[PDB]
Design a binder for this molecule. Structure first.
Ligand code: CL
Ligand code: CL
Ligand code: ZN
Ligand code: ZN
Ligand code: ZN
Lengths: 29, 29, 29
């Protein structure tokens, strides 16, 4: 269960970095 | 303690999925 | 380790809220 929590948090951190990147590309690109 | 953190993670997963769909909408007009 | 997991989730929640508000602005120009 701990590993599953850590993996889900890491996946969300990566998804948020990817979304902020795509937002910046849409706004400025 | 654990159950509340899992609930917060599930709500954050729902929120990120919604942001990804909204950002895809904006990329298409 | 548990406290680190909670502080990281709190930081992700703040970052996703910021993404949400920024996407709302872009949606409107
Ligand atoms: Cl475990
Ligand atoms: Cl896209
Ligand atoms: Zn497309
Ligand atoms: Zn709105
Ligand atoms: Zn509106």
């Amino acid at each position: 269960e701990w590993e599953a929590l850590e993996k889900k948090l890491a996946a969300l951190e990566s998804k948020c970095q990817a979304l902020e990147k795509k937002l910046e590309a849409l706004e400025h690109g």
